[PDB]
Design a binder for these strands. Structure first.
Lengths: 140, 78, 118
RNA sequence: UUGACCUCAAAUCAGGUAGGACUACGCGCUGAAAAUAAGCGCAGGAAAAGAAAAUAACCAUGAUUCCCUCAGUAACGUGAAGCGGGAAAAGCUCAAAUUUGAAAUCUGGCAACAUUUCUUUUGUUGUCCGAGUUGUAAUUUCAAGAAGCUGCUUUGAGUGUAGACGAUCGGUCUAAGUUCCUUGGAACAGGACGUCAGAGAGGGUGAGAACCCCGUCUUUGGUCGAUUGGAUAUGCCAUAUAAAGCGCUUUCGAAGAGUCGAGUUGUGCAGCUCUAAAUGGGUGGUCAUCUAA
RNA sequence: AAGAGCAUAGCUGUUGGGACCCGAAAGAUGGUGAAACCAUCUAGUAGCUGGUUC
């Protein structure tokens, strides 16, 4: 009706036909590979979550439930596996630190972490006692 | 259950610095026309005339009250 | 009785929102669609005998429950810096709401950053 | 005699940006015989609002928006709001505190080196000039927090490769009568005999065509692409002399002014006259609640 | 004083929306000409006139 839409009604240029509509636009799953294998491309998301043993929501369902009649283990072992592979949170000492703590321990014994902190010459960086122990245990 | 203080309710108490900064500006800036007139009336002891003048200027009694003791202490320090 | 609002898009708004739910969780599968909300008492005399979902767990609820503010929003536990526990009843009802949550939670490990040296 | 700056210019100076259109919905402002129409200004795929200077009077609630309810109630024919049920959910950033054992920051020129929806896009590295101490970074935002002490737990604004997985653009593949008899210019009609069907939607063809043709179903998919989203595996670099959470405190805790507000005037806001404070100030019912500019 | 309603659909009545159909003299906004004109408000206003279908 509008001149604009009358233009391409009386024009000869073909439209920009864009083919988009899909009945039941159930979006397919990406993200986790485990769930993506064991998804049901037909059933609904709240069915699929309850099928797998995953709580769809922790909070109460604000409507009805589905009553038709009168993976979680895999996710668990995969989880503890990766925590095991990436577990060694311990860090070594760089060459500077290797000398830095050695010179402090070669002169203030080994357990007087309050004395090393008070030192003004060797403990130039003014590291507190809590970090001095951290560098100590990091050496071993 | 008693509840630990929410740090918003701390607002407006005072500071040792913010008080100090406010004291310096009071001396440095000087005094407004009305504060000059009010101060002179205290020195002449026409306080009842002085206090009623302040309420006309500011608008409320507590505001008028509060400014009077600010100026009187200034008088004694001077 | 001028301009009217007519609801012929009510059935299509029902599906538009259903597809948005479908689109959302499909992006974040293993995790639930929604966060956990606390259980709070309505603020009236007509409604103080009922329990309803809150906005999030106060600072003290998470502190006793064992999560700090920063790691509580990552794993999906909203915080409510406004709300506060005036009585031990609400503290215990919501502390043990997070207790069952942290028991049913499987926090997957992330990728670490390991510099070549210390 | 020579120079710092401060302010102000000029240039077809180097590089940039603004205007006009559309206006269904957005935000203003102005405004009739309804805060309407018309007028005026301004935006985006949404806009606006928005992390309480908020309600309430409870066993308290907890940004905003929207729907239902509250409710034609309350207040004064106009016409609420809180609570209640839902949809959606996500939080945050500055100013005000000395980096003072180091302006740690950034624009630009050139020089290189990569990257690309892309020779069109986007940066990094070095280097010189400047910006900037009348304050650019790090830190902090009241929910706090900083500075110490403590001892536990954590860490990439990287870059290739590979595969799976979604997203888009285009190309590509699809079952079975056109067999006889009468009507007719025409068999797509009538009858006979058969077939296909995950396809008997629709259209075309010389009259009612599942089986002539295009399609339809398969397709919630095969196939060749072309770009890409986010994860996963693995390789190579990595400033970690660091940065962050939480116990503890014999330490401290900065918080927005011709604005709040009082008098009057125009229809909460605005104009004029005057002009604040620091447990202060605002809003509710001495307590509660919030912490504006 | 041993509760009778709640919802829906239909019929009819009535009140309000353009309100059974058509029709009056003004006005308001914003414009175009040189008070007039133009498109809006606007289906302005009816106590009244005319019509109202087997």
């Amino acid at each position: 009706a509008n001149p604009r839409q009358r233009n391409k009604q009386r024009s000869g240029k073909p439209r920009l036909t864009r083919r988009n509509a899909n009945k039941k636009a159930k979006a397919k799953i990406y993200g986790n590979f485990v769930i993506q294998q064991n998804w049901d491309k037909h059933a609904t998301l709240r069915q699929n979550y309850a099928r797998l043993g995953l709580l769809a929501t922790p909070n109460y369902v604000t409507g009805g439930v589905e009553k038709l009649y009168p993976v979680v283990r895999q996710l668990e072992e995969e989880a503890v596996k990766k925590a095991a592979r990436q577990s060694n949170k311990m860090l070594p000492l760089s060459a500077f630190e290797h000398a830095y703590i050695q010179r402090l321990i070669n002169k203030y014994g080994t357990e007087d972490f309050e004395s090393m902190a008070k030192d003004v010459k060797l403990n130039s960086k003014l590291f507190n006692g809590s970090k001095l122990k951290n560098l100590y245990i990091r050496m071993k | 259950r008693q509840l630990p203080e929410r740090p918003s309710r701390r607002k407006g108490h005072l500071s040792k610095r913010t008080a100090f900064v406010r004291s310096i500006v009071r001396e440095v800036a000087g005094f407004a026309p009305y504060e000059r007139r009010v101060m002179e009336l205290i020195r002449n002891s026409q306080d009842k005339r002085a206090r009623k003048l302040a309420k006309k200027r500011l608008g409320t009694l507590k505001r008028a009250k509060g400014k009077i003791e600010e100026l009187t202490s200034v008088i004694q320090s001077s | 009785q001028r301009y009217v609002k007519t609801w012929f898009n009510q059935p299509g708004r029902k599906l538009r929102r259903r597809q948005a739910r479908q689109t959302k969780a499909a992006k974040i599968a293993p995790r639930p669609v929604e966060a956990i909300r606390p259980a709070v008492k309505p603020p009236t005399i007509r409604y103080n005998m009922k329990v309803r979902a809150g906005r999030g767990f106060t600072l003290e609820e998470l502190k006793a429950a064992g999560v700090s503010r920063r790691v509580a929003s990552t794993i999906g536990i909203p915080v409510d810096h406004r709300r506060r526990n005036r009585s031990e009843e609400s503290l215990q009802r919501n502390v043990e709401r997070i207790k069952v949550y942290l028991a049913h939670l499987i926090v997957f490990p992330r990728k670490a950053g390991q510099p070549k040296k210390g």
